[PDB]
Write a protein that binds this ligand. Sequence first.
Ligand SMILES: Nc1ncnc2c1ncn2[C@@H]1O[C@H](COP(=O)(O)OP(=O)(O)OP(O)(O)=S)[C@@H](O)[C@H]1O
Length: 311
Amino acid sequence: QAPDREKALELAMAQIDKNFGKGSVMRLGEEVRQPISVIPTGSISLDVALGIGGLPRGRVIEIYGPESSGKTTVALHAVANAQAAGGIAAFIDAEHALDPEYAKKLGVDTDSLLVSQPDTGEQALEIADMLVRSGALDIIVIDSVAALVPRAEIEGGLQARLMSQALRKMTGALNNSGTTAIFINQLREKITGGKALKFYASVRLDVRRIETLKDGTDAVGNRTRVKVVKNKVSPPFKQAEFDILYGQGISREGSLIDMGVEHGFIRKSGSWFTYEGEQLGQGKENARKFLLENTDVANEIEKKIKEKLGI
Ligand SMILES: Nc1ncnc2c1ncn2[C@@H]1O[C@H](COP(=O)(O)OP(=O)(O)OP(O)(O)=S)[C@@H](O)[C@H]1O
């Protein structure tokens, strides 16, 4: 033998990358690259947690979690962006429970949104598969990795075969075009077709609600905690928190404050948030409305926060 572990570690470790991929071996500390592709999630907090500024384009994302925790509110946002930037979004509904005016308020352009309501789970994966091949799409989202039942099981082993099939036959395709895919999975525990997905998924988000956003009266919404358990595009395990107001989505202004203080730019103490000499207000909800009505200063915080971190 001879070399200093390191010089022999990164040698093989590099050997690994060549043979299996990029995100194969990683040292959780790394700042590792930035592929100019990434869909903001609307949550500066989350997409800085993803390590690239948003959900990677040309990968398959899995957003699991209990109900009423936000998974979709995110996806719906996800669409809102990659769509407000010239992209074409397709939503493969198998839940039949999408609210438009909720979406309308999050930035999605419903009218130029492709909605399909498959009959089988085998069909849903196809129109999604042939639809993802036209390269026309940017972001496609399948609602309910669960509500994708095969034909049998409606006349007379299971889905994780259907899924597995669909995934292989689609992961390849998915990236030659550049369409990142989202899958909402959910309530089969709390404290189906997994297998396949749990392994193709380049990134897996754990969206669980933590607290009901009280607002003097009863409450404006809910605060969510996402844990990116699997990340192949950067270092995994980072987590992020943010607020969701009842019918108004992820609170941008509110998200900046959190980031605005945990990184300095905004000073507290006295329950009086103050952005360098200039105060905002007393009570996160009042300095939240200060940002909400002052995009000017707001941008600046958001601006500084991204420099200080991920471009
Ligand atoms: N039409 C609506 N009106 C008001 N608030 C809504 C509406 N749709 C969703 N919300 C809020 O958004 C949050 C959860 O987003 P959901 O769509 O339920 O995401 P999940 O991803 O939690 O979804 P299932 O899986 O529960 S739809 C809740 O805290 C709700 O208050």
